[PDB]
Amino acid sequence: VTQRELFEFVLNDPLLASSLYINIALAGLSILLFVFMTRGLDDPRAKLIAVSTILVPVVSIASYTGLASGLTISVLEMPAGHFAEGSSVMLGGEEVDGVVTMWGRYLTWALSTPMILLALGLLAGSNATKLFTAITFDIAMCVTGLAAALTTSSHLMRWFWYAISCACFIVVLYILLVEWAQDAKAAGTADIFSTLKLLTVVMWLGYPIVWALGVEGVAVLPVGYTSWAYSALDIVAKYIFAFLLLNYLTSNEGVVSG
Amino acid sequence: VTQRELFEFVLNDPLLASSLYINIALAGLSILLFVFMTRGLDDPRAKLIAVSTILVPVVSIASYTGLASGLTISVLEMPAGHFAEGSSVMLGGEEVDGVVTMWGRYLTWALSTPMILLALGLLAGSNATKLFTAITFDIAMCVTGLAAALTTSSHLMRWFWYAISCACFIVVLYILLVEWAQDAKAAGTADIFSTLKLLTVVMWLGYPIVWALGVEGVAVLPVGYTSWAYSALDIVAKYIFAFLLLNYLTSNEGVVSGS
Amino acid sequence: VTQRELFEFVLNDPLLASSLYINIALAGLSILLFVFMTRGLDDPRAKLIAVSTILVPVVSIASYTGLASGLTISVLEMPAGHFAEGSSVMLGGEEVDGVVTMWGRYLTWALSTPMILLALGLLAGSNATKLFTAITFDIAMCVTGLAAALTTSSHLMRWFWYAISCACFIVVLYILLVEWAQDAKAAGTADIFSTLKLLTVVMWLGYPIVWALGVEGVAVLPVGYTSWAYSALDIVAKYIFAFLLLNYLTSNEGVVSGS
Ligand SMILES: CC(/C=C/C=C(C)/C=C/C=C(C)/C=C/[C@H](CCC(C)(C)O)C(C)(C)O)=C\C=C\C=C(C)\C=C\C=C(C)\C=C\C=C(C)\C=C\[C@H](CCC(C)(C)O)C(C)(C)O
Ligand SMILES: CC(/C=C/C=C(C)/C=C/C=C(C)/C=C/[C@H](CCC(C)(C)O)C(C)(C)O)=C\C=C\C=C(C)\C=C\C=C(C)\C=C\C=C(C)\C=C\[C@H](CCC(C)(C)O)C(C)(C)O
Ligand SMILES: CC(/C=C/C=C(C)/C=C/C=C(C)/C=C/[C@H](CCC(C)(C)O)C(C)(C)O)=C\C=C\C=C(C)\C=C\C=C(C)\C=C\C=C(C)\C=C\[C@H](CCC(C)(C)O)C(C)(C)O
Ligand SMILES: *C/C=C(C)/C=C/C=C(C)/C=C/C1=C(C)CCCC1(C)C
Ligand SMILES: *C/C=C(C)/C=C/C=C(C)/C=C/C1=C(C)CCCC1(C)C
Ligand SMILES: *C/C=C(C)/C=C/C=C(C)/C=C/C1=C(C)CCCC1(C)C
Ligand SMILES: [Cl-]
Ligand SMILES: [Cl-]
Ligand SMILES: [Cl-]
Ligand SMILES: [Cl-]
Ligand SMILES: [Cl-]
Ligand SMILES: [Cl-]
């Protein structure tokens, strides 16, 4: 399959196309809004938190460009027994075996989610040890999930990588729910943290669910539905999450200064 | 050549399959042990050393799964003049030109090795400059080793990359043997450091040798033995190494405190 | 299109081959020269700058080896509307459609440019916030540049990434020209920083110009000429830039010794 065919496949499919191009527009508009909102920051620690946050939609716009252009999408055949094995996709007038694997999402999450975690950790006044733990295991979760999506030799290996990824995820969840909830009180950011933490935990839990229900998993959701589900999660987990963090940050630059 | 053909290819050859699936379980079992061993730590600095150390077997289980699943393995045709050139593999009933390239190892080494170094550097009370130097050259060592294995155009190029990788390695060896060995004194970990240090250097020194002997080098060793050589080296350079460091840490948390 | 075909295409193409092999040599000689020059450094901060600087030619030799070997080169077909669409390369013995894409340059810039910036920011006495910002957007610039060259589906998509990459570039430019220019005055390195600042801004502006003029862009410059333009830029932006920064550092260790 050609990159252009996958690019044409995205266009031609209103559902799939809208899920991608809307976030290219939204992520781009977010970057511009966030830069305008924080233009007045003077404190370097507050600025560090703002840059880290702004990088979230910066990575997002590139991720969606990679997906919509076909650069980071592949057509893969599922292993023996996989709920979607034997499926076909059809590019233009031709029909090919396999499923539309949008691995570009999983790959870029390894870049954007560490930035969400770094911004949140700093906001909560975390120490280096916890930031390092959250971030490394977070990256490990994103990479093993990518590996699971790219494995086509065995149906079991796929879910095994999915398990490894879930294990790394509980670590991140633990420091978010336990560790940082405490740190935030000592930092004077318990209020905004509890909000972002609640949002983060609930929205993030959605990704592995969507993964299991879409073509990658048990395939009960079509490609266009699974994509909008992720694009919807991103809109909250990234764009509104960042708007709320930066909205607070610009009104509380002094508290975050340290 | 599909991923499916490489997966089962690991089978039908218990010599190769064992070296892989065995470390998957040893890595996982090591992770469990370490987590319960370090349940007592409370010092943020001692906690850093532990997490850094625990990540080694974490990257290892994923690395072996990538290899075992056929995800990070390929069949490459060696260049003219290469000893393994003109070889076949046959992923089943059909035989194809090339050799079984397990690049999956070299790729993850750029992730695991930096963590081993992070742990050691912290133990010795190293400063940032030395940590930065060790980790950057260690990563360069791994990536060029990976490039060496993927180069199929020229035999001399493969060896040129090998040479570059060796130059980066001496940089790591130098900080281990000369720099940190001295920092460990001011940190008060010279004792445990010398131990881990001696272990690390001897074990790492074997990876390039294995590479040179395996199918990607002179090809005197079979993919099964080379895989076991590495698999054996990891058990020491990673798991047992992690245990020694962690064992010390749990018993001497106040030594590496400074928090 | 095999790696070998690419490796042989470079050879038998004097322009292209010379733009690659010459810098494998210049990078290597630069590494030796810089190590020799910095031998007497003792302050940890002074040595951080030096190591960060030396890593520039280390990444560079590996980059050029990757290109000369054919490992990081590919033949791609340009999208409709591209002034290089439907082009032929005549690779090996048979004419092949597409353009020789040396994407290995963009891939390694993501590793080398952050080191140039770390060295400069340190030289200017930058806080961690500006260093984080400069380096992350620099990496974003490089990765989206690589994505642009790797995009064959749409012509518009290629220039859009180029646009995103440019946006990231202005952040780096602003930090160099606005932020660090003022910081260097407090760090007592105003003179040398302003010099390296300018050399850097001028040479870096050269890369997107070459990208746009070369085969990746409007194609007014054939592959061998686009390659020499990049190789000429690297000699100034990397090797002589590093030579000048180290020349200053070794005569002013105390000025940047700080902590
Ligand atoms: C808006 C935007 C993109 C919009 C896209 C749109 C609308 C696409 C529409 C597509 C359509 C309709 C498609 C239709 C299809 C076919 C249609 C057809 C006609 C063909 O048929 C169909 C029908 C579905 O099939 C991008 C912005 C993109 C924006 C970018 C790339 C911005 C970059 C900014 C940066 C990078 C600033 C950074 C600033 C910083 C880091 C500032 C720093 C300060 C701190 C500085 C310090 C510390 C260094 O001193 C701070 C205080 C934090 O601000
Ligand atoms: C146990 C495990 C895996 C076990 C696997 C086994 C037994 C596999 C067996 C396979 C077989 C027999 C195959 C046979 C083949 C048949 C093949 C065929 C296809 C036919 O079937 C045949 C026959 C040869 O051919 C994994 C764990 C995997 C575990 C993972 C991925 C864990 C992640 C979590 C961590 C590492 C927590 C970390 C917690 C930390 C760092 C907590 C923090 C504390 C500090 C707190 C702070 C910093 C947050 O404040 C600290 C003190 C550091 O602990
Ligand atoms: C010189 C060199 C290479 C030269 C290559 C040449 C000339 C190639 C020529 C090719 C030709 C002509 C080809 C022709 C083709 C065919 C021709 C034919 C005839 C065959 O037909 C044709 C015609 C085009 O088609 C490499 C060096 C290569 C060098 C390397 C790889 C060096 C590594 C060193 C390190 C990594 C040290 C590092 C030291 C450090 C970091 C020291 C640290 C100090 C601080 C210490 C601390 C922090 C640890 O405490 C410090 C102060 C920073 O120095
Ligand atoms: C901007 C993107 C965000 C916030 C992405 C978040 C992604 C996750 C929390 C993904 C988790 C997964 C698992 C826990 C199991 C395996 C599969 C994944 C990758 C979907
Ligand atoms: C867990 C894995 C470990 C500790 C791996 C260590 C690997 C090395 C020290 C590899 C070194 C190599 C060279 C010095 C030369 C070229 C080839 C390599 C990659 C095998
Ligand atoms: C050693 C390499 C150096 C100094 C490389 C510098 C590269 C740039 C400044 C590249 C910038 C680019 C853009 C701003 C737009 C898109 C294309 C690029 C990647 C050429
Ligand atoms: Cl600042
Ligand atoms: Cl993303
Ligand atoms: Cl802690
Ligand atoms: Cl590993
Ligand atoms: Cl030092
Ligand atoms: Cl480079």
Side-chain angles (χ1 to χ4, degrees), chain A residues 49-124:
Chain A
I49 296 166
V51 174
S52 178
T53 300
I54 287 170
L55 279 168
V56 166
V58 170
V59 167
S60 188
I61 194 180
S63 183
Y64 277 100
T65 299
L67 295 161
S69 68
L71 176 67
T72 60
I73 295 169
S74 292
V75 57
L76 304 180
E77 294 185 1
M78 295 302 97
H82 190 291
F83 279 81
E85 82 161 309
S87 306
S88 66
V89 54
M90 262 230 73
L91 301 312
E94 56 176 55
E95 190 175 305
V96 186
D97 296 279
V99 302
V100 175
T101 301
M102 294 172 76
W103 54 267
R105 282 183 186 286
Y106 324 136
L107 177 61
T108 61
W109 293 346
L111 302 169
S112 63
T113 63
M115 292 300 95
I116 287 175
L117 248 23
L118 181 276
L120 267 186
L122 292 170
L123 168 69

Side-chain angles (χ1 to χ4, degrees), chain B residues 16 34 57-58 82 112 117 135 180 213 217 242:
Chain B
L16 193 284
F34 307 147
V58 172
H82 186 84
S112 49
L117 273 53
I135 297 168
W180 289 342
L213 295 173

Side-chain angles (χ1 to χ4, degrees), chain C residues 78-79 81-85 87 99 106 148-149 155 158-159 162 207-223 226 230:
Chain C
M78 296 300 94
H82 195 289
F83 294 77
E85 76 162 310
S87 294
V99 298
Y106 319 133
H155 195 203
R158 285 179 74 85
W159 290 106
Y162 181 100
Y207 294 79
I209 290 167
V210 175
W211 198 99
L213 287 174
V215 294
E216 321 261 343
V218 77
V220 293
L221 284 43
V223 63
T226 63
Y230 284 134

Side-chain angles (χ1 to χ4, degrees), chain B residues 92-214:
Chain B
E94 187 276 301
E95 199 167 8
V96 294
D97 294 69
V99 304
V100 178
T101 304
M102 290 178 67
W103 48 272
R105 291 179 182 281
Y106 326 130
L107 174 67
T108 65
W109 289 346
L111 300 174
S112 49
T113 62
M115 291 304 137
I116 290 173
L117 273 53
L118 208 220
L120 290 179
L122 291 167
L123 186 58
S126 181
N127 61 190
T129 299
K130 294 165 187 179
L131 259 304
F132 176 96
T133 307
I135 297 168
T136 53
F137 282 93
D138 169 66
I139 290 172
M141 175 186 76
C142 295
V143 172
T144 47
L146 175 69
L150 285 304
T151 302
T152 63
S153 68
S154 151
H155 191 195
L156 185 60
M157 285 287 208
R158 295 183 57 92
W159 290 101
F160 178 49
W161 247 308
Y162 182 110
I164 296 168
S165 185
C166 289
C168 295
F169 188 20
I170 73 179
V171 180
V172 181
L173 296 169
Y174 182 96
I175 63 87
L176 290 168
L177 305 168
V178 184
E179 295 286 276
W180 289 342
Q182 305 310 307
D183 283 336
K185 297 177 185 176
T189 61
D191 52 296
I192 183 62
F193 184 71
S194 182
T195 308
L196 297 175
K197 177 195 64 175
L198 192 57
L199 181 61
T200 294
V201 179
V202 179
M203 294 302 101
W204 286 43
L205 285 170
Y207 291 85
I209 308 178
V210 173
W211 199 94
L213 295 173

Side-chain angles (χ1 to χ4, degrees), chain A residues 4 8 27 35 67 126 157 193 201 212 217 237 256:
Chain A
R4 176 177 47 206
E8 284 156 351
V35 167
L67 295 161
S126 166
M157 285 290 201
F193 181 75
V201 172
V256 311

